[PDB]
Design a protein around this ligand. Structure first.
Ligand SMILES: CC(=O)N[C@H]1[C@H](OC[C@@H]2COCCO2)O[C@H](CO)[C@@H](N)[C@@H]1O
Length: 513
């Protein structure tokens, strides 16, 4: 794939990947790189920092306010009033000013921009946050939080109850609760009225409240989350907590009857002797079609059609891809087509794993389902590859140093046989150190580095009233917190389909040390 043929393909993540590959091997000339901003589906991350080593284009400042960026903290009083206010959007700039210039600018702006006045006068004190808090300036609170996480202070009921009306609130609460920072912020958020929050914010405040053993407020927070959540999975997560705290049996029933298949609905079914949910069985009789399941470009194309589709087209696509060769795609289409009400747990390219013990098959299949939905040429935003979504570094270490495959290329990860083989190899590594398939899942996504760090702490995956479920809410990376829960559900299911059932309650017992 020369830069030439790549330019003739539609903008996609596949195209990005391949451009990235030329870049990392230094095969893109400064010539080649000229018209290349335009050819890049997602100009973020390494492809951006890599292309900016060739062409450092680091504009851009708006033609109108160009004058404004010629002033510094020394000459800002020589700037017109528009320029003054523009530069005062940066708390760093404000911090850089001297105090008497802050006093002057503060008077200048008291009328029309008291937001600026409050921050200016705040930075004339030994504690800006404290000044902002006393004024109950909500916009300013968040600007200070984004400027420095290190400010921590008790907040009264009046003030905390106004914080959730700002966009910044959700991430602010998620961050400090999950990171266990800003103790005084956290303590103060116990007095947020549940009426004033919803959805994820309410859920996180439920978790907060548990950590201080305030189970009543936790319940009310979790209840409000249950009633407002958009996704059934999340709603189930919250009903679980409602139940675990108060043990109202109408809550567990509701959860056991959920259309969403997740660890909480699974657990609830097991606690109530409810039968395992229905799993669809896909066996297309037809053998193959044209489609090249090894062409990454074709996946990106067909993936776009599938997402920008309606009744008419979906049904043509479902029938087109109703073959054994294209089964992953068939399921992908069906999953969308029936609006996620049906549960699909295919086992494609089964030959490549049928000889492993059933417990290991389930783990592999569980990872692949979450990683890729078994799409062989799947590529992530970080350029992880194939069904098992290997990062290129790791794929090359295994392929070249460890397993010594002849003529190994990282694009070998697009082969089922290889994906499953390297996955098995890497899962052997992880399971041998971690034991629990939950822990393994955490480490497959976020690395064993952070997994071991988290397990070493004495407030994670130890014993306690609400364990291990609380620890699962406090996994410090969001992507990994979610990943673990989803893969664990898939694991239960696949062990079931493989005739190697386990009670999920036993998984939960062995999460405590
Ligand atoms: C193709 C893709 O982007 N997969 C990502 C996957 O996204 C979910 C996929 C998207 O494609 C359809 C199936 O689920 O999330 C994982 C983290 O949970 C990532 N490590 C995977 O790389």
């Amino acid at each position: 794939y020369s830069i030439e043929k790549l330019k003739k393909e539609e903008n996609s993540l596949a195209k990005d990947y391949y451009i990235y590959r030329l870049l990392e091997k230094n095969k893109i000339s400064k010539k080649d790189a000229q018209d290349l901003n335009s050819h890049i589906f997602r100009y973020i991350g390494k492809i951006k920092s890599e292309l900016e080593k060739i062409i450092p284009l680091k504009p851009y400042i708006n033609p109108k306010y160009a004058k404004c960026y010629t002033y510094t903290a020394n000459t800002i009083l020589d700037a017109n009033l528009t320029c003054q206010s523009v530069r005062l959007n940066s708390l760093v700039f404000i911090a850089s000013l001297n105090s008497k210039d802050r006093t002057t600018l503060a008077q200048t702006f008291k009328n029309q921009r008291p937001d600026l006045t409050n921050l200016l006068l705040a930075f004339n004190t030994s504690d800006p946050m404290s000044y902002i808090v006393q004024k109950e300036d909500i916009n300013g609170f968040f600007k200070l939080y984004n400027y420095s996480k290190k400010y921590d202070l008790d907040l009264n009921t009046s003030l905390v109850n106004k914080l959730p009306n700002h966009i910044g609130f959700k991430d602010f609460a998620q961050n400090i609760i999950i990171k266990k920072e800003n103790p005084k912020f956290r303590h103060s958020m116990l007095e947020i009225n549940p009426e004033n929050v919803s959805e994820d914010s309410a859920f996180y405040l439920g978790v907060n409240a548990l950590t201080y053993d305030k189970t009543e407020l936790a319940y009310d927070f979790f209840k409000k989350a249950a009633q407002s959540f958009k996704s059934q999975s999340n709603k189930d997560n919250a009903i679980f907590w409602m139940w675990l705290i108060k043990n109202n049996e109408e809550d567990l029933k509701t959860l056991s009857q959920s259309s969403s298949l997740n660890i909480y609905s699974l657990y609830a079914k097991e606690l109530t002797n409810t039968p395992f949910p229905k799993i669809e069985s896909l066996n297309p009789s037809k053998k193959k079609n044209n489609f090249n399941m090894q062409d990454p470009f074709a996946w990106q194309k067909i993936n776009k059609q599938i997402r920008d589709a309606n009744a008419s087209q979906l049904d043509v696509l479902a029938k087109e891809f109703d073959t054994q060769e294209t089964l992953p795609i068939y399921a992908y289409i069906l999953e969308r087509k029936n609006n996620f009400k049906k549960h699909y747990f295919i086992m494609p390219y089964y030959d490549n794993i049928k000889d492993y013990n059933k417990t290991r098959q389930a783990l592999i299949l569980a990872i692949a389902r979450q990683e890729s939905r078994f799409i062989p040429t799947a590529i992530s935003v970080s350029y992880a590859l194939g069904m098992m979504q290997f990062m290129p570094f790791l794929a090359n270490h295994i392929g070249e140093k460890e397993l010594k495959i002849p003529n190994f290329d990282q694009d070998f990860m697009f082969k089922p046989e290889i994906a499953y083989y390297f996955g098995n190899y890497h899962l052997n590594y992880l399971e041998s150190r971690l034991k629990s398939p939950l822990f393994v899942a955490y480490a497959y996504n976020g690395g064993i580095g952070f997994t071991n760090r988290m397990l070493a702490r004495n407030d994670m995956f130890k014993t306690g009233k609400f364990e291990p479920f609380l620890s699962m809410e406090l996994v410090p990376y969001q992507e990994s917190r979610i990943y673990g829960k989803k893969v664990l559900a898939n694991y239960i299911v696949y062990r079931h389909l493989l005739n190697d059932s386990i009670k999920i309650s036993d998984i939960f017992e062995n999460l405590i040390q």
